[PDB]
């Protein structure tokens, strides 16, 4: 399913983004 | 017959304008935000993210162990630092609607903040009949700003604890260990004091029905305490007054 792939891509990018933002926030 | 195009179905994936809106915001709230976006987007190098599994309990599992596993599930969704709000939460919705949302949150498995956690905590503890659940809201002041934070207070066999989500470890989970409601609240006040926040207001909700089809709303503001106008002992007595009008109602 191309919708399922788009879903998993968006959620993977959301959590990679959240990882970066947590590292910024926690170091401050 | 009829290809699915269910515009009334929520959930990921989201449309391309909403998706850009997040990345545009990311460049604004992060020093090297544009490089963050460039590196994350399109990269075939991103970790797989498993869907957290909502805990299941044997009937003999004690309530304090269930609370720890519920809090742990809520934590592995992670605190939302992305800059976005992933769920629209209308606090005046019937409980049954808020529980549909909580279920959807478990299926989408996105990061959350304090209010999503309160909603999830109720959803995930409806099946514990000897547990009372009630929202606790804090208004604080710090450095020219006012902040609002909510957790789900709980009471198990006479001991008060809390489930929640916060950027700070001491502003969320509390095991059901305090003998009184004022000790639970004063514990949150101390944690705020640790970070130089001034507690201005405490809003105590009513206990929430365990019935997930209930059409009743949550009473978020059943007691409102202006802590600075109360002082110290009137504060402790007003807290204990709500707790007794909670155990008799």
Q: In this complex, how many residue pairs, one in chain A and one in chain B, have their CB atoms less than 8 Å apart?
A: 59
Find out whether B211 and B150 touch, Cβ atoms under 8 Å: no
Q: Measure A20 CA to nearest chain B CA, in Å.
A: 8
d(C-alpha B60, C-alpha B62), whole Å: 6
* Residue found by looking up tokens 């059943």 in the block: B222
Find out whether A28 and B90 touch, Cβ atoms under 8 Å: no
* Residue found by looking up tokens 């019937």 in the block: B94
* Chain A residue with minimum CA distance to B44: A9
Any idea where the domains of chain A sit in the sequence?
Answer: 1-28
Q: Is the N-terminal amide bond of B47 cis, ω within 30° of 0?
A: no
For residue B95, count other CB atoms closer than 10 A to its CB: 22
d(C-alpha B94, C-alpha B92), whole Å: 7
Find out whether B212 and B195 touch, Cβ atoms under 8 Å: no
Please tell me if residue A23 touches chain B, with a CB cutoff of 8 Å.
no
Resolution limit, Å: 2.3
Tokens of B73: 């599930």
d(C-alpha B218, C-alpha B64), whole Å: 24
> CA nearest B125: which of B76, B158, B161?
B161
d(C-alpha B102, C-alpha B54), whole Å: 12
d(C-alpha B233, C-alpha B246), whole Å: 20
d(C-alpha B49, C-alpha B57), whole Å: 24
Please tell me if residue A18 touches chain B, with a CB cutoff of 8 Å.
yes
Find out whether B139 and B201 touch, Cβ atoms under 8 Å: yes
Q: Measure A6 CA to nearest chain B CA, in Å.
A: 6
Of B14, B109, B111, the CB nearest to A18: B111
> Residues of B numbered 73-92 whose beta carbons fall under 8 angstroms of chain A's beta carbons: which are they?
78-83
Please tell me the experimental approach by which this structure was elucidated.
X-ray
d(C-alpha B121, C-alpha B178), whole Å: 19
d(C-alpha B19, C-alpha B31), whole Å: 20
Identify the residue among A7, A16, A28 best suited for mutation to test binding to B, counting B beta carbons within 10 A and taking the highest.
Answer: A16
């Amino acid at each position: 399913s191309a919708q399922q792939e788009l879903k998993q891509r968006q959620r993977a990018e959301i959590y990679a983004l959240n990882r970066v933002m947590t590292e910024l926030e926690q170091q401050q | 017959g009829g290809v699915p195009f269910f515009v009334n179905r929520g959930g990921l994936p989201v449309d391309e304008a909403t998706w850009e809106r997040m990345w545009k915001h990311v460049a604004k709230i992060h020093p090297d935000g544009e490089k963050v976006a460039q590196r994350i987007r399109g990269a075939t190098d991103l970790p797989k993210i498993p869907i957290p599994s909502v805990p299941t309990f044997q009937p003999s599992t004690p309530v304090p162990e269930r609370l720890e596993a519920v809090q742990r599930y809520i934590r592995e969704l992670q605190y939302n630092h992305t800059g976005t709000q992933f769920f629209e939460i209308k606090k005046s919705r019937p409980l049954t609607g808020l529980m549909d949302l909580a279920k959807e949150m478990t299926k989408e498995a996105l990061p959350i903040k304090c209010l999503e956690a309160v909603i999830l905590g109720i959803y995930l503890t409806n099946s514990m009949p000897t547990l009372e659940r009630f929202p606790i809201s804090f208004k604080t002041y710090f450095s020219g700003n006012y902040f609002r934070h909510i957790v789900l207070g709980v009471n198990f066999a006479g001991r008060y604890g809390a489930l929640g989500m916060s950027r700070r470890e001491d502003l969320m989970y509390k095991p059901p260990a305090f003998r009184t409601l004022s000790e639970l609240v004063l514990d949150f006040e101390a944690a705020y004091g640790r970070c130089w926040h001034v507690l201005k207001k405490v809003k105590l909700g009513q206990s929430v029905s365990h019935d997930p089809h209930s059409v009743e709303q949550i009473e978020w503001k059943h007691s409102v305490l202006d802590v600075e106008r109360l002082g110290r002992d009137d504060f402790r007595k007003e807290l204990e007054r709500h707790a007794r009008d909670m155990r008799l109602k």
